[PDB]
Design a protein around this ligand. Structure first.
Ligand SMILES: Cc1cc2nc3c(=O)[nH]c(=O)nc-3n(C[C@H](O)[C@H](O)[C@H](O)COP(=O)(O)OP(=O)(O)OC[C@H]3O[C@@H](n4cnc5c(N)ncnc54)[C@H](O)[C@@H]3O)c2cc1C
Ligand SMILES: NC(=O)c1ccc[n+]([C@@H]2O[C@H](COP(=O)([O-])OP(=O)(O)OC[C@H]3O[C@@H](n4cnc5c(N)ncnc54)[C@H](OP(=O)(O)O)[C@@H]3O)[C@@H](O)[C@H]2O)c1
Ligand code: NA
Length: 537
């Protein structure tokens, strides 16, 4: 029995559509599957107020850099979601990729057929399709879901979850005019920090329910002149080589100096300058030991805390906005447009729900351990937590992917898992999404997988699976790299420690943090050497 398809690609975000385009371009038969109506992923689903890139538009736009849509015109230095969706749509047109997709269709199960070396993919628990290779591009973040909070359904006002915002016939978000309404926003991640300032413009009152403050820095967004855009486009071959060489694929690289190689005076001027410069420079152009050394991190953390105390008038509000929890840059840093100055407004209140946890949502609003809040609107900006978990993925011996990774993700090259032959996992925390410019990182990863699939076709191979030794070595290296950073202690739950019944200890990280260029170099050493570490047949 032979499969109907060379490959199934799950997902129509920037990663999946590019992967599908590439497979078809190589003269293979691909079917893409997408839950939503159309292309975009992130940029299709997230329509909340203030949704905007943290990556410079020209650097995220890999499809423009690569010469798929080089004529593309960015209107701002950090594109908003509507422009992002137009971008993805234009790319999809040029790739002529929509014809290879089933939209409005959810993959419910994927089961590997050992005797046939193929994947049975189940669509909406009904139709089954067969493919040689299954490729997930289901997103590094999973699921809009109501958060773990009692009484959400009881609220009589307007509810919004940030990743499911209601829209009008044009696709533009609706119910965004908060004139005369008392608003609650739960969560202060990158999503909340984008919503809060804009909600404040129209809301009668705004309560921010903050469980943990993040380190946020100014975005410094501005419009993009035609002159600048043309100048950038002309420089695209240089820009593409540059972003292909930095550790994150953002257009920034670490200063070669340690924090202690300069005086306190010099560090101060250095930070002051970066802080005022648009984009991630203050994080990604920092001293080389910023994420390796406690003292170095403290220099910058102390500086950013100084800035928060500058921008927020009330000294009490300010200290509750400054993290003590974690080092600077240990989470992907939220960038902001006048975030801190929002709290200076009369109609804006910070509610500390660490000290006073939410007990439940109510017909009238929200109830904390020591107060009740009457509200007309609640916005859940409460995040995402994996996209693969929602699919019943079964490998050899009917083993669940969920179980195989229960002790932490285990892969070779971040791309295949032993037990799951012919299955590629694109763009997730386990292969570097967390801190990447995903437009570039994801695109490069899809090209590598294409090259592997093409090699197998050329050689008549129909089976690929990592050896246990290659997978173990790779996964142990990924942990070792991670453990040398400050992230190890900062996010404890990012490490899975298993002490087996026999007494041995296994440590895995949920988050791969190695430099992109180094990671790709390793992938090419493997590929060139006839995919050493993969069993192929
Ligand atoms: C608000 C927001 C802002 C961001 N900004 C940046 C940024 O500035 N820079 C950056 O590098 N990264 C950013 N990211 C991270 C972002 O995930 C990537 O930039 C990128 O969009 C990921 O693309 P993707 O194709 O891999 O996944 P997605 O864009 O998430 O697409 C995955 C698709 O798969 C579909 N899918 C999932 N499961 C199934 C299934 N079972 N069956 C059928 N379809 C399924 C989903 O519907 C979705 O459309 C941001 C993320 C968010 C949420
Ligand atoms: N380009 C951009 O500027 C942009 C915009 C949005 C998102 N993103 C990316 O997408 C990722 C997700 O960001 P996000 O802001 O949507 O989510 P997030 O980072 O996970 O933050 C969710 C927020 O909600 C809180 N929270 C979660 N569950 C809660 C509950 N049950 N009750 C009360 N509070 C709760 C969290 O607090 P705790 O910390 O205590 O859990 C946190 O403050 C980010 O890592 C970011 O990189 C990027
Ligand atoms: Na105030």
């Amino acid at each position: 029995k032979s499969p109907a398809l060379d490959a199934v690609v799950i997902g129509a975000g920037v990663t999946g559509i590019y992967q599908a385009f590439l497979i078809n371009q190589a003269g293979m038969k691909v079917l893409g599957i997408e839950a939503g109506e159309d292309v975009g992923g992130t940029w299709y689903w997230n329509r909340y107020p203030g949704c905007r890139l943290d990556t410079e538009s020209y650097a995220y736009g890999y499809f423009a850099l690569k010469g798929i849509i080089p004529e593309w015109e960015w209107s701002e230095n950090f594109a908003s979601q509507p422009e992002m969706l137009r971008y993805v749509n234009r790319a999809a047109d040029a790739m002529d990729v929509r014809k290879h997709y089933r939209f409005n269709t959810r993959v419910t199960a994927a089961r590997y057929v050992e005797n046939d070396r193929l994947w049975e993919v189940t669509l909406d628990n009904e139709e089954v399709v067969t493919c040689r290779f299954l490729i997930s591009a289901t997103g590094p973040l999973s699921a809009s879901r109501m958060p773990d909070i009692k009484g959400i359904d009881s609220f009589k006002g307007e509810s919004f979850h940030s990743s499911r915002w209601p829209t009008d016939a044009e696709g533009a978000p609706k119910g965004v005019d908060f004139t005369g309404k008392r608003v609650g926003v739960i969560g202060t991640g990158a999503t909340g920090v984008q919503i809060i300032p804009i909600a404040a413009e129209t809301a009668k009152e705004l309560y921010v329910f903050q469980r943990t403050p993040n380190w946020c820095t100014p975005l410094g967004n501005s419009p993009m002149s035609k002159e600048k855009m043309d100048s950038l486009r002309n420089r695209y071959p240089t820009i593409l080589e540059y972003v292909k060489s930095t550790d994150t694929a953002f257009p920034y690289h670490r200063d070669p100096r340690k924090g202690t190689d300069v005086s306190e005076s010099e560090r101060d001027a250095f930070f002051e300058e970066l802080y005022r410069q648009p984009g991630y420079g203050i994080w990604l152009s920092g001293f080389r030991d910023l994420l390796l050394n406690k003292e170095s991190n403290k220099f910058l953390a102390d500086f950013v805390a100084k800035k928060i105390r500058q921008r927020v008038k009330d000294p009490v509000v300010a200290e509750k906005l400054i993290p003590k929890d974690h080092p600077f840059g240990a989470k992907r840093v939220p960038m902001e447009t006048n975030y801190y100055e929002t709290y200076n407004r009369d109609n804006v209140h910070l509610v500390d729900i660490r000290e006073a946890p939410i007990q439940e949502v109510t017909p009238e609003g929200i109830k904390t351990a020591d107060a009740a809040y009457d509200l007309d609107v609640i916005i859940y900006a409460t995040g995402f937590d994996g996209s693969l978990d929602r699919i019943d993925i079964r490998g050899k011996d009917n083993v669940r992917l969920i179980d195989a990774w229960a002790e932490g993700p285990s892969t070779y090259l971040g791309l295949q898992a032993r037990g799951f032959p012919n299955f590629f996992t694109l763009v997730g925390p386990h292969n570097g999404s967390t801190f990447c410019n995903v437009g570039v990182c994801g695109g490069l990863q899809a090209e590598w997988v294409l090259r592997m699939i093409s090699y197998m076709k050329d050689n008549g191979f129909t089976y690929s699976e990592p050896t246990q030794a290659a997978e173990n070595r790779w996964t142990e290296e990924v942990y070792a790299d991670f453990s040398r950073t400050l992230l190890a202690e900062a996010n404890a739950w990012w490490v899975k420690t298993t002490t087996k019944p026999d007494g041995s200890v296994v440590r895995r990280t949920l988050v791969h943090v190695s430099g992109g260029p180094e990671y790709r170099k390793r992938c090419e050493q493997v590929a060139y050497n006839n995919y050493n570490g993969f069993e192929l047949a």
